[PDB]
Amino acid sequence: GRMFAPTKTWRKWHRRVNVHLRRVAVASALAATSVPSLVLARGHRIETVP
C-alpha cells in the first residue's frame, strides 16, 4: 500500500540561526578550549601538555 504520511521533499531540512547568536556560540566555545578541566571532560588526553 501507501505509507501513512509519505515523506515529501519540502520538509524543513535547513535551520536558520541569527548571525549574532552564532558568533556568541563560537566565542563561548572558544573560551571553553582554554580551561583544561573542560578539555579533559571531553576525553582529550592532555596530561603532558605544557
Partner RNA sequence: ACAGGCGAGAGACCGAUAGCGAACAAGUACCGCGAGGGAAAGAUGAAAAGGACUUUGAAAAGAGAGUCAAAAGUGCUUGAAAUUGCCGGGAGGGAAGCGGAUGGGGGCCGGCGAUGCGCCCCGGCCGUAUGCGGAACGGCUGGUCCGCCGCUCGG
Partner RNA sequence: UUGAAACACGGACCAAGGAGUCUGACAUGCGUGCGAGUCGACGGGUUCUGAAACCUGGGAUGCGCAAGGAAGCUGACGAGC
Partner RNA sequence: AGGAGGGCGCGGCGGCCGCUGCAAAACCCGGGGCGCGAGCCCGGGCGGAGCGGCCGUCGGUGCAGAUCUUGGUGGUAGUAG
Q: Does 48 bind RNA (CB under 7 A)?
A: no
> Do the beta carbons of residue 46 and residue 40 sit within 8 Å?
yes
CB of 24 to another protein, least distance (A): 13
Quote the CA–CA distance of 6 and 32 in Å, as a whole number.
Answer: 43
> Do the beta carbons of residue 18 and residue 25 sit within 8 Å?
no
Q: Which is nearer to another protein, 18 or 48 (CB)?
A: 48
Q: Does 42 bind another protein (CB under 8 A)?
A: yes
Q: Which of 11, 37, 47, 48 binds RNA (CB under 7 A)?
A: 11
